[PDB]
Amino acid sequence: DVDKYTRARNAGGKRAQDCMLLAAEGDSALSLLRTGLTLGKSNPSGPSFDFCGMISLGTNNKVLQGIVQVLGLDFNCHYKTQEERAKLRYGCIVACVDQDLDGCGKILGLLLAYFHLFWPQLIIHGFVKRLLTPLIRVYEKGKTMPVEFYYEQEFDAWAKKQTSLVNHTVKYYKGLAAHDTHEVKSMFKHFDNMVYTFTLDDSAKELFHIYFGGESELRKRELCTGVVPLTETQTQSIHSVRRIPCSLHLQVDTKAYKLDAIERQIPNFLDGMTRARRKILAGGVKCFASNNRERKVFQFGGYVADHMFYHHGDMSLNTSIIKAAQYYPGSSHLYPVFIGIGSFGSRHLGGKDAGSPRYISVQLASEFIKTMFPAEDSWLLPYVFEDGQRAEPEYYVPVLPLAIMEYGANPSEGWKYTTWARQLEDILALVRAYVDKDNPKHELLHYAIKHKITILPLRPSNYNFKGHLKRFGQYYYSYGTYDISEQRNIITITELPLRVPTVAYIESIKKSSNRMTFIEEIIDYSSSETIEILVKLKPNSLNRIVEEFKETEEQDSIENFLRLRNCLHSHLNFVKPKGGIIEFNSYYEILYAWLPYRRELYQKRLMREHAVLKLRIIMETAIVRYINESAELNLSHYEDEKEASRILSEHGFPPLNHTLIISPEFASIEELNQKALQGCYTYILSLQARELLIAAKTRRVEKIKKMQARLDKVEQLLQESPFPGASVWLEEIDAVEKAIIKGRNTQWKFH
Amino acid sequence: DVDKYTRARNAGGKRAQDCMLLAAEGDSALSLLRTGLTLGKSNPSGPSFDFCGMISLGTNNKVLQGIVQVLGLDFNCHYKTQEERAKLRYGCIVACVDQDLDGCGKILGLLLAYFHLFWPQLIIHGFVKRLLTPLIRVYEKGKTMPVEFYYEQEFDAWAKKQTSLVNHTVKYYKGLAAHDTHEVKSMFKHFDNMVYTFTLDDSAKELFHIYFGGESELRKRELCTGVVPLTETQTQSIHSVRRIPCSLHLQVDTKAYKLDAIERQIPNFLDGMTRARRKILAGGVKCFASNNRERKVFQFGGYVADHMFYHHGDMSLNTSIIKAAQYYPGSSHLYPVFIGIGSFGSRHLGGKDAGSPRYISVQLASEFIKTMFPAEDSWLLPYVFEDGQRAEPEYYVPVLPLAIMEYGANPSEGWKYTTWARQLEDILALVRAYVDKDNPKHELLHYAIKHKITILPLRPSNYNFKGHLKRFGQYYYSYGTYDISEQRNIITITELPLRVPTVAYIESIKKSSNRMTFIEEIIDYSSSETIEILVKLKPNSLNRIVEEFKETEEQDSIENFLRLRNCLHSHLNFVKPKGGIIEFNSYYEILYAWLPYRRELYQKRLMREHAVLKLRIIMETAIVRYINESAELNLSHYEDEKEASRILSEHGFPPLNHTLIISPEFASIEELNQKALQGCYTYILSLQARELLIAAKTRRVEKIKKMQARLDKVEQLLQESPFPGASVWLEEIDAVEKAIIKGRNTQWKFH
């Protein structure tokens, strides 16, 4: 008699062991189970409300008390014998949950952990079972029976064997609510053979404690290794006999859920941004590339959700977009991705005083983004594929390491990740030394890469900070500035610590009762982007600070009475490109680790551009030849495109892939070579009449000469002394520095 | 001790009357005021923290007590004298709020009503003042000083005088957070002359009571007339002297806020959908017209927000989209706009058991939408312009009246608005009689339009309802069906009332203690889209049911013991096309009112199509002539497009607007005519080489003949006996009926 529970007719009777209990994840799962269990005469052999019941998931916890009650199961008794298990009201319990991150791995792990702790034997003897639903279904034109895969590895192997997939439609069912009516009927036609039973092995217990409870730091070693997908052999064993080990489930599904939660709040060290921020930046590039026109934040958030598969909520999306475009002293972004149009926030509230997204408008900082995040190597990066559709890249490789250049908070849990931005005069020196041959410290820096000698210094950025950055011991401290007016007995605060909000700071002083007694009222007259706080002392409290706070050597008496000093603690915790968590002892290590990724990207970008440019030279030469011969190869006399194509072939015109040459998109060199040459003659038949003019030929001929000149130049760039593309790096660093300086001269407005 | 309050230096002193208090709407407004009041030496003559303070808006209400405390003002005393007024801590209070719907009109109305209720003399004597920020700024290239308008009427008059606006950029500042840094400095440079004072007149007394407090049936008359914009004379008087009447504010801003709130939950009678639903349908048409490919609900919601200016939240957007695609017995939509892929809900939970939008996928019901909402008259409709951008249409005019054809329920926060769908055949009979000449009731129906004779019947739809619709008195009742099994002492419920959810119905019986005593356990074995509920009676309890509920004729004893009867209450509340609320006594009046709108739309669609088709005939004829003469007018010789255009003109080729003729879009007939022949020769120079082939000419020539044949047909269509386009309405109606029947044969899946 618990809620959302429908008993079976034979539950608790002589056929109790034949009965099974279905544990639905939510209301949508309950509706699907009700649909399947009531197929009627359409599924004579399928399950029904006889010998089957439903319960909703959604010792203190109420829902577990309901599952315990309906099962007629008791805590103290250990179910080591068959006779003891016969008393149970249901033969087994089946969990019906989604196959997403907030699916298998979290709800399943909690249910497995709950049953593992109290009653370990039930897992060994197969009391706990799981409903395995197809994950990927591939539909072929003209065929009504799809091909169903329960794992992505099987689909990947199948896709490799199938070669072209133009006639195949692939749909990803990552949740129980994604199944259509006909699909659900098909699943319940074979309900028996999709039920998989959990098994308990030796490895499970150590993994169960690691992932659930068991204090911590034994889970860190697990989470720094990344997700290892199930191999082909393991999956075949799963399908051969429907006995899924708990260990394999824990280290695939639960591990991925934990890693996904970590990656939400911890950035990648290559670009210093999380997956959500990467989607916004990639969505921002796509939105404003065609036309850099100002858009509302909620409109831009809708674009990101539609085009970058953002499903975490508009509130989180709008907040992240606002933070991305915020620019003020002590803001998280020293170089915001977007240009903030409107009141995006202030240092006094720590960015929490942003306007409503309906009125707040956003615009991409094209000058900074196009130079720091070049569009010609975004084709070259690995990309995230989500539900089979292209999403934001796995990581961005910018010209300069943003993970060192920004401020990172991660206030709640999340491996306590924190970063303090290094200044642009030390990062540039390191990178230029690594690249420029003529820099005297070029050889020294390379010798220091393999030995961690850190010859050059890295220091905190003092930009937008009217204070002192002093080094004491092994830590950096930021000091505020104060003014004392003896005659009016007023203490004026002109600057706060590095990342201390004004409103929060005033509350800290007021809450401190012992500090408070010396003052009577604090009034904040600080302007925007500048601190000016009036502190009114008691008539005779002028000295009381001096003889009470003892005048510490590191911290002044006023700097002790007023909390104008904070310690800069750096916790360099980052996500590896392949997954997992990497710990850096110092910032130079992050810069050293980022350097090879950009160096390879430059090298392989030139290879692709060389290949693409060679095809374009062939294409443009053919087009110019046609325009020269267009008069006597006049296409009017020929009937259709087939006859025209035959005539063009007879005259020695090369067939080319028209769309692939002009827009190679995301294509590897070998894929580029194999497809480009095999093409139609669309590049000739689609020429407009305006392209046959004399001026059109001259521009096309001049374009051919420029591409031939560029082709020779790129060949020279490949054979460079340090590494290919070294000279290109330096000129792109200069462009980035100019963009930053111009954006710093303005208030990151670029106008 | 008031939060978010910054006192002025001279507040409460000798210069208290010179002091003014700024009432910020929120944190964003507070930041803007802090920025403006601290311009420093950049604005020597502007306001500063001297003689100015800030308070946050955000008798029992806390903030109003805070405003009272900081002002040093007392309730009992009436401020009828200057000497009494001098005691106040601030000379005046200025409210800084947005100029949006949740801006002026709601927060301002509440503050004006609050001050008018207690201290009316303060409003007369100008204690309460307002900050009138510019609403629209127009920027011209090469000019750094924009043109600022405080009302939309002024901007409309200005735009009419300026003719072409290609060189002008228009930005709408409907909120305090939309002002950029340079704009805020410009506003505060002239802070004094943008402060407007509130004045109380004779009409304000009654409008304050009407819009705040008082009886109903008096605000109703105010809300059924629509919003009348301020005339040019009133705005000029407002601008000449900064004394804005309270009456004008109440009947423009507050009325619009109330009308917007009403329209959000009450639909237009022409299409039976609200503004939010209209955005989703219009966004759905745009999204799936290019490629009717299945999309996730959250992705589609992002598209709607980005393209249709939806800012009410993803949660409301996703819920509305889910309701639009829900299809089950008793659902709100008998003909859903979208095709539901996945578990969109069930009748048992009343649609509340829908899946998560991440897994739920949506797809437009293209076969039904195009027939019922033709794309060729969507250009002809009036459209909503929001922040200067095109949005969803003001209303849709479908082939059949959807406001009659759907189910409507609205929570009683306002007008009740309950609608029960009329039968499809009854609606078809009425409309066909109105249009078809040969229908014997054609003349009778027209004579009944002007006399409300309602000759033909309209009855509630019994589709997806296995029950009884009986008429008792003037009301309609829906009866469920039950089965009684004497041997097993079980009452089986096979059908519920028309729109009664299963779970809610079970709760009603369980929470009715008098009814419960007779039964011991209710178990729900109902399948999807079918009711099958088992009711277990006490061993002797059958008799007492009979001799207690008394077997009234209207309602059976079991139909009384089990609440299997419900009354269909019709509250025909709808929004007029021009604004306001209209009351309909019966469904025929709605159908009679909808008929002229579709009839006019058919008439004026033909005229536009006739005009458009004539231009296309000219353009295609010119193109065909060029292809015939392309050999001896070979454009290869001529240097550029200018020389080629001159040659084409010399040979007698008409210059035409290439883009406008092929896609006229939102263009009126006279605008179409004036912008058609004034173009260029792009329609010739942009012709591809594949268009010069012999087969291309034959298709183009055949196309010309078809358009000439269609042109003659349309001229015949204009001269029709009942009204122009009558024979196009009938064929359209048939297509809609076929689409509905095909969608009813399936489960609104269509494949």
Side-chain angles (χ1 to χ4, degrees), chain B residues 468 470 479-482 515 549 551-565:
Chain B
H468 303 291
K470 301 171 190 161
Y479 290 82
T481 64
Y482 61 91
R515 263 165 264 272
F549 294 89
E551 182 65 26
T552 187
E553 181 287 336
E554 287 194 8
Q555 189 175 3
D556 202 351
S557 296
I558 301 299
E559 276 157 10
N560 212 354
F561 172 57
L562 304 171
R563 293 180 179 91
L564 295 180
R565 189 268 301 275

PDB file of all heavy atoms in Angstrom, chain B residues 468 470 479-482 515 549 551-565:
ATOM      1  N   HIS B 468     -21.246   8.284 -22.598  1.00  0.00           N
ATOM      2  CA  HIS B 468     -22.522   8.857 -22.998  1.00  0.00           C
ATOM      3  C   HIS B 468     -22.492  10.364 -22.802  1.00  0.00           C
ATOM      4  O   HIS B 468     -22.049  10.851 -21.758  1.00  0.00           O
ATOM      5  CB  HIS B 468     -23.669   8.241 -22.197  1.00  0.00           C
ATOM      6  CG  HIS B 468     -23.751   6.751 -22.317  1.00  0.00           C
ATOM      7  ND1 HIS B 468     -24.119   6.120 -23.486  1.00  0.00           N
ATOM      8  CD2 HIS B 468     -23.503   5.770 -21.420  1.00  0.00           C
ATOM      9  CE1 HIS B 468     -24.099   4.812 -23.300  1.00  0.00           C
ATOM     10  NE2 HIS B 468     -23.729   4.573 -22.055  1.00  0.00           N
ATOM     11  N   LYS B 470     -25.161  13.011 -22.584  1.00  0.00           N
ATOM     12  CA  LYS B 470     -26.584  13.269 -22.436  1.00  0.00           C
ATOM     13  C   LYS B 470     -26.823  14.743 -22.142  1.00  0.00           C
ATOM     14  O   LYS B 470     -26.015  15.392 -21.472  1.00  0.00           O
ATOM     15  CB  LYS B 470     -27.184  12.407 -21.323  1.00  0.00           C
ATOM     16  CG  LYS B 470     -27.019  10.914 -21.541  1.00  0.00           C
ATOM     17  CD  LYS B 470     -27.421  10.122 -20.309  1.00  0.00           C
ATOM     18  CE  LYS B 470     -27.019   8.662 -20.438  1.00  0.00           C
ATOM     19  NZ  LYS B 470     -26.990   7.971 -19.120  1.00  0.00           N
ATOM     20  N   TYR B 479     -20.914  10.697 -19.120  1.00  0.00           N
ATOM     21  CA  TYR B 479     -21.072   9.578 -18.204  1.00  0.00           C
ATOM     22  C   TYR B 479     -20.036   8.502 -18.495  1.00  0.00           C
ATOM     23  O   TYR B 479     -19.799   8.150 -19.654  1.00  0.00           O
ATOM     24  CB  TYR B 479     -22.475   8.981 -18.315  1.00  0.00           C
ATOM     25  CG  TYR B 479     -23.574   9.862 -17.770  1.00  0.00           C
ATOM     26  CD1 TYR B 479     -24.112  10.887 -18.533  1.00  0.00           C
ATOM     27  CD2 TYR B 479     -24.093   9.648 -16.502  1.00  0.00           C
ATOM     28  CE1 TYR B 479     -25.122  11.688 -18.040  1.00  0.00           C
ATOM     29  CE2 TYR B 479     -25.105  10.438 -16.003  1.00  0.00           C
ATOM     30  CZ  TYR B 479     -25.615  11.457 -16.773  1.00  0.00           C
ATOM     31  OH  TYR B 479     -26.620  12.245 -16.272  1.00  0.00           O
ATOM     32  N   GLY B 480     -19.420   7.982 -17.436  1.00  0.00           N
ATOM     33  CA  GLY B 480     -18.565   6.827 -17.571  1.00  0.00           C
ATOM     34  C   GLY B 480     -19.357   5.534 -17.607  1.00  0.00           C
ATOM     35  O   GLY B 480     -20.565   5.503 -17.375  1.00  0.00           O
ATOM     36  N   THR B 481     -18.656   4.445 -17.903  1.00  0.00           N
ATOM     37  CA  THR B 481     -19.261   3.124 -17.990  1.00  0.00           C
ATOM     38  C   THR B 481     -18.671   2.217 -16.920  1.00  0.00           C
ATOM     39  O   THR B 481     -17.479   2.300 -16.610  1.00  0.00           O
ATOM     40  CB  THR B 481     -19.053   2.502 -19.374  1.00  0.00           C
ATOM     41  OG1 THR B 481     -17.655   2.287 -19.600  1.00  0.00           O
ATOM     42  CG2 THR B 481     -19.600   3.418 -20.456  1.00  0.00           C
ATOM     43  N   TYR B 482     -19.514   1.356 -16.356  1.00  0.00           N
ATOM     44  CA  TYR B 482     -19.097   0.445 -15.301  1.00  0.00           C
ATOM     45  C   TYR B 482     -19.685  -0.934 -15.560  1.00  0.00           C
ATOM     46  O   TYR B 482     -20.706  -1.082 -16.236  1.00  0.00           O
ATOM     47  CB  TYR B 482     -19.526   0.946 -13.916  1.00  0.00           C
ATOM     48  CG  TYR B 482     -21.022   1.085 -13.749  1.00  0.00           C
ATOM     49  CD1 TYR B 482     -21.787   0.034 -13.263  1.00  0.00           C
ATOM     50  CD2 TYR B 482     -21.671   2.266 -14.077  1.00  0.00           C
ATOM     51  CE1 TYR B 482     -23.151   0.155 -13.111  1.00  0.00           C
ATOM     52  CE2 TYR B 482     -23.035   2.397 -13.927  1.00  0.00           C
ATOM     53  CZ  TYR B 482     -23.770   1.337 -13.444  1.00  0.00           C
ATOM     54  OH  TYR B 482     -25.130   1.462 -13.292  1.00  0.00           O
ATOM     55  N   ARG B 515     -17.820   7.260   0.897  1.00  0.00           N
ATOM     56  CA  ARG B 515     -17.789   6.297  -0.198  1.00  0.00           C
ATOM     57  C   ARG B 515     -16.845   5.139   0.110  1.00  0.00           C
ATOM     58  O   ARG B 515     -17.108   3.996  -0.282  1.00  0.00           O
ATOM     59  CB  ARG B 515     -17.370   7.007  -1.482  1.00  0.00           C
ATOM     60  CG  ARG B 515     -18.520   7.438  -2.370  1.00  0.00           C
ATOM     61  CD  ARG B 515     -18.035   8.442  -3.404  1.00  0.00           C
ATOM     62  NE  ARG B 515     -18.272   9.817  -2.982  1.00  0.00           N
ATOM     63  CZ  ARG B 515     -19.389  10.491  -3.217  1.00  0.00           C
ATOM     64  NH1 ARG B 515     -20.391   9.951  -3.890  1.00  0.00           N
ATOM     65  NH2 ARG B 515     -19.500  11.741  -2.777  1.00  0.00           N
ATOM     66  N   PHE B 549     -27.757   6.095  -1.996  1.00  0.00           N
ATOM     67  CA  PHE B 549     -27.621   7.131  -3.015  1.00  0.00           C
ATOM     68  C   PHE B 549     -28.934   7.440  -3.730  1.00  0.00           C
ATOM     69  O   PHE B 549     -29.008   8.442  -4.452  1.00  0.00           O
ATOM     70  CB  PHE B 549     -26.526   6.734  -4.005  1.00  0.00           C
ATOM     71  CG  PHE B 549     -25.152   6.701  -3.390  1.00  0.00           C
ATOM     72  CD1 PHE B 549     -24.671   5.544  -2.804  1.00  0.00           C
ATOM     73  CD2 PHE B 549     -24.357   7.836  -3.369  1.00  0.00           C
ATOM     74  CE1 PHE B 549     -23.420   5.513  -2.226  1.00  0.00           C
ATOM     75  CE2 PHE B 549     -23.106   7.808  -2.790  1.00  0.00           C
ATOM     76  CZ  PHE B 549     -22.638   6.643  -2.218  1.00  0.00           C
ATOM     77  N   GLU B 551     -30.747   6.457  -6.269  1.00  0.00           N
ATOM     78  CA  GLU B 551     -31.037   6.173  -7.676  1.00  0.00           C
ATOM     79  C   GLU B 551     -31.815   7.320  -8.330  1.00  0.00           C
ATOM     80  O   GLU B 551     -32.964   7.171  -8.754  1.00  0.00           O
ATOM     81  CB  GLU B 551     -31.792   4.843  -7.803  1.00  0.00           C
ATOM     82  CG  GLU B 551     -32.123   4.391  -9.223  1.00  0.00           C
ATOM     83  CD  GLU B 551     -30.885   4.083 -10.033  1.00  0.00           C
ATOM     84  OE1 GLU B 551     -29.853   3.742  -9.419  1.00  0.00           O
ATOM     85  OE2 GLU B 551     -30.945   4.187 -11.277  1.00  0.00           O
ATOM     86  N   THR B 552     -31.197   8.497  -8.368  1.00  0.00           N
ATOM     87  CA  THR B 552     -31.797   9.602  -9.104  1.00  0.00           C
ATOM     88  C   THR B 552     -31.816   9.286 -10.594  1.00  0.00           C
ATOM     89  O   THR B 552     -30.973   8.539 -11.100  1.00  0.00           O
ATOM     90  CB  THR B 552     -31.050  10.913  -8.835  1.00  0.00           C
ATOM     91  OG1 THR B 552     -31.764  12.001  -9.435  1.00  0.00           O
ATOM     92  CG2 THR B 552     -29.645  10.872  -9.404  1.00  0.00           C
ATOM     93  N   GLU B 553     -32.812   9.827 -11.296  1.00  0.00           N
ATOM     94  CA  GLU B 553     -32.976   9.496 -12.708  1.00  0.00           C
ATOM     95  C   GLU B 553     -31.768   9.944 -13.523  1.00  0.00           C
ATOM     96  O   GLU B 553     -31.285   9.201 -14.385  1.00  0.00           O
ATOM     97  CB  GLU B 553     -34.281  10.109 -13.231  1.00  0.00           C
ATOM     98  CG  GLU B 553     -34.633   9.829 -14.699  1.00  0.00           C
ATOM     99  CD  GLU B 553     -33.777  10.587 -15.696  1.00  0.00           C
ATOM    100  OE1 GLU B 553     -33.225  11.645 -15.328  1.00  0.00           O
ATOM    101  OE2 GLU B 553     -33.649  10.116 -16.844  1.00  0.00           O
ATOM    102  N   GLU B 554     -31.260  11.150 -13.259  1.00  0.00           N
ATOM    103  CA  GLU B 554     -30.153  11.679 -14.053  1.00  0.00           C
ATOM    104  C   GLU B 554     -28.880  10.864 -13.864  1.00  0.00           C
ATOM    105  O   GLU B 554     -28.127  10.651 -14.821  1.00  0.00           O
ATOM    106  CB  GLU B 554     -29.900  13.144 -13.698  1.00  0.00           C
ATOM    107  CG  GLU B 554     -30.949  14.104 -14.225  1.00  0.00           C
ATOM    108  CD  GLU B 554     -30.499  15.546 -14.157  1.00  0.00           C
ATOM    109  OE1 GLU B 554     -29.315  15.788 -13.839  1.00  0.00           O
ATOM    110  OE2 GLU B 554     -31.329  16.440 -14.423  1.00  0.00           O
ATOM    111  N   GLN B 555     -28.619  10.397 -12.645  1.00  0.00           N
ATOM    112  CA  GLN B 555     -27.356   9.751 -12.314  1.00  0.00           C
ATOM    113  C   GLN B 555     -27.633   8.420 -11.635  1.00  0.00           C
ATOM    114  O   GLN B 555     -28.348   8.370 -10.630  1.00  0.00           O
ATOM    115  CB  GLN B 555     -26.510  10.654 -11.413  1.00  0.00           C
ATOM    116  CG  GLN B 555     -25.090  10.182 -11.190  1.00  0.00           C
ATOM    117  CD  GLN B 555     -24.277  11.179 -10.392  1.00  0.00           C
ATOM    118  OE1 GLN B 555     -24.792  12.210  -9.962  1.00  0.00           O
ATOM    119  NE2 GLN B 555     -22.999  10.882 -10.197  1.00  0.00           N
ATOM    120  N   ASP B 556     -27.053   7.348 -12.167  1.00  0.00           N
ATOM    121  CA  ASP B 556     -27.275   6.017 -11.624  1.00  0.00           C
ATOM    122  C   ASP B 556     -26.692   5.902 -10.216  1.00  0.00           C
ATOM    123  O   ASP B 556     -25.863   6.710  -9.789  1.00  0.00           O
ATOM    124  CB  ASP B 556     -26.657   4.964 -12.545  1.00  0.00           C
ATOM    125  CG  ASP B 556     -27.267   3.594 -12.358  1.00  0.00           C
ATOM    126  OD1 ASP B 556     -28.045   3.414 -11.401  1.00  0.00           O
ATOM    127  OD2 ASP B 556     -26.976   2.698 -13.177  1.00  0.00           O
ATOM    128  N   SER B 557     -27.149   4.881  -9.485  1.00  0.00           N
ATOM    129  CA  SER B 557     -26.649   4.662  -8.129  1.00  0.00           C
ATOM    130  C   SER B 557     -25.151   4.398  -8.133  1.00  0.00           C
ATOM    131  O   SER B 557     -24.411   4.947  -7.308  1.00  0.00           O
ATOM    132  CB  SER B 557     -27.390   3.499  -7.472  1.00  0.00           C
ATOM    133  OG  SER B 557     -28.765   3.794  -7.313  1.00  0.00           O
ATOM    134  N   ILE B 558     -24.685   3.554  -9.055  1.00  0.00           N
ATOM    135  CA  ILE B 558     -23.250   3.347  -9.199  1.00  0.00           C
ATOM    136  C   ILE B 558     -22.593   4.599  -9.763  1.00  0.00           C
ATOM    137  O   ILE B 558     -21.478   4.962  -9.372  1.00  0.00           O
ATOM    138  CB  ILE B 558     -22.974   2.111 -10.072  1.00  0.00           C
ATOM    139  CG1 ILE B 558     -23.613   0.874  -9.442  1.00  0.00           C
ATOM    140  CG2 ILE B 558     -21.481   1.901 -10.241  1.00  0.00           C
ATOM    141  CD1 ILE B 558     -23.080   0.549  -8.070  1.00  0.00           C
ATOM    142  N   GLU B 559     -23.275   5.284 -10.684  1.00  0.00           N
ATOM    143  CA  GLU B 559     -22.794   6.566 -11.178  1.00  0.00           C
ATOM    144  C   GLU B 559     -22.847   7.656 -10.118  1.00  0.00           C
ATOM    145  O   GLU B 559     -22.268   8.727 -10.328  1.00  0.00           O
ATOM    146  CB  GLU B 559     -23.600   7.003 -12.402  1.00  0.00           C
ATOM    147  CG  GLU B 559     -23.119   6.401 -13.707  1.00  0.00           C
ATOM    148  CD  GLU B 559     -24.195   6.384 -14.772  1.00  0.00           C
ATOM    149  OE1 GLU B 559     -25.252   7.015 -14.563  1.00  0.00           O
ATOM    150  OE2 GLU B 559     -23.986   5.737 -15.819  1.00  0.00           O
ATOM    151  N   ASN B 560     -23.536   7.420  -9.002  1.00  0.00           N
ATOM    152  CA  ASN B 560     -23.495   8.320  -7.859  1.00  0.00           C
ATOM    153  C   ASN B 560     -22.473   7.856  -6.828  1.00  0.00           C
ATOM    154  O   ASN B 560     -21.707   8.667  -6.298  1.00  0.00           O
ATOM    155  CB  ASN B 560     -24.882   8.431  -7.220  1.00  0.00           C
ATOM    156  CG  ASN B 560     -25.138   9.796  -6.619  1.00  0.00           C
ATOM    157  OD1 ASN B 560     -24.246  10.640  -6.570  1.00  0.00           O
ATOM    158  ND2 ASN B 560     -26.361  10.018  -6.155  1.00  0.00           N
ATOM    159  N   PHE B 561     -22.453   6.552  -6.536  1.00  0.00           N
ATOM    160  CA  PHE B 561     -21.433   6.007  -5.648  1.00  0.00           C
ATOM    161  C   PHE B 561     -20.040   6.194  -6.230  1.00  0.00           C
ATOM    162  O   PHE B 561     -19.097   6.542  -5.511  1.00  0.00           O
ATOM    163  CB  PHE B 561     -21.705   4.528  -5.375  1.00  0.00           C
ATOM    164  CG  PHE B 561     -20.598   3.843  -4.632  1.00  0.00           C
ATOM    165  CD1 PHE B 561     -20.184   4.311  -3.398  1.00  0.00           C
ATOM    166  CD2 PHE B 561     -19.969   2.734  -5.168  1.00  0.00           C
ATOM    167  CE1 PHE B 561     -19.162   3.689  -2.715  1.00  0.00           C
ATOM    168  CE2 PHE B 561     -18.947   2.106  -4.489  1.00  0.00           C
ATOM    169  CZ  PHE B 561     -18.543   2.584  -3.262  1.00  0.00           C
ATOM    170  N   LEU B 562     -19.883   5.953  -7.526  1.00  0.00           N
ATOM    171  CA  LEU B 562     -18.648   6.246  -8.235  1.00  0.00           C
ATOM    172  C   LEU B 562     -18.867   7.516  -9.042  1.00  0.00           C
ATOM    173  O   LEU B 562     -19.831   7.605  -9.808  1.00  0.00           O
ATOM    174  CB  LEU B 562     -18.245   5.091  -9.150  1.00  0.00           C
ATOM    175  CG  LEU B 562     -18.088   3.710  -8.513  1.00  0.00           C
ATOM    176  CD1 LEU B 562     -17.910   2.655  -9.584  1.00  0.00           C
ATOM    177  CD2 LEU B 562     -16.923   3.684  -7.539  1.00  0.00           C
ATOM    178  N   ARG B 563     -17.980   8.494  -8.879  1.00  0.00           N
ATOM    179  CA  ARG B 563     -18.174   9.774  -9.546  1.00  0.00           C
ATOM    180  C   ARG B 563     -17.909   9.635 -11.039  1.00  0.00           C
ATOM    181  O   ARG B 563     -16.898  10.128 -11.548  1.00  0.00           O
ATOM    182  CB  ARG B 563     -17.262  10.840  -8.939  1.00  0.00           C
ATOM    183  CG  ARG B 563     -17.599  11.215  -7.506  1.00  0.00           C
ATOM    184  CD  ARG B 563     -16.644  12.279  -6.997  1.00  0.00           C
ATOM    185  NE  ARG B 563     -16.934  12.686  -5.628  1.00  0.00           N
ATOM    186  CZ  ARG B 563     -16.398  12.126  -4.552  1.00  0.00           C
ATOM    187  NH1 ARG B 563     -15.550  11.116  -4.648  1.00  0.00           N
ATOM    188  NH2 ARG B 563     -16.718  12.594  -3.349  1.00  0.00           N
ATOM    189  N   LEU B 564     -18.819   8.967 -11.747  1.00  0.00           N
ATOM    190  CA  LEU B 564     -18.665   8.688 -13.167  1.00  0.00           C
ATOM    191  C   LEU B 564     -19.375   9.706 -14.049  1.00  0.00           C
ATOM    192  O   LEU B 564     -19.432   9.521 -15.267  1.00  0.00           O
ATOM    193  CB  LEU B 564     -19.169   7.280 -13.484  1.00  0.00           C
ATOM    194  CG  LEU B 564     -18.380   6.132 -12.855  1.00  0.00           C
ATOM    195  CD1 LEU B 564     -18.972   4.792 -13.252  1.00  0.00           C
ATOM    196  CD2 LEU B 564     -16.917   6.212 -13.254  1.00  0.00           C
ATOM    197  N   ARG B 565     -19.914  10.772 -13.466  1.00  0.00           N
ATOM    198  CA  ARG B 565     -20.590  11.815 -14.221  1.00  0.00           C
ATOM    199  C   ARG B 565     -19.941  13.151 -13.907  1.00  0.00           C
ATOM    200  O   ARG B 565     -19.674  13.457 -12.741  1.00  0.00           O
ATOM    201  CB  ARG B 565     -22.088  11.855 -13.894  1.00  0.00           C
ATOM    202  CG  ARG B 565     -22.909  12.769 -14.793  1.00  0.00           C
ATOM    203  CD  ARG B 565     -23.037  14.175 -14.230  1.00  0.00           C
ATOM    204  NE  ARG B 565     -23.656  14.201 -12.912  1.00  0.00           N
ATOM    205  CZ  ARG B 565     -24.965  14.208 -12.698  1.00  0.00           C
ATOM    206  NH1 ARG B 565     -25.829  14.187 -13.699  1.00  0.00           N
ATOM    207  NH2 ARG B 565     -25.418  14.240 -11.448  1.00  0.00           N
TER     208      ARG B 565
END
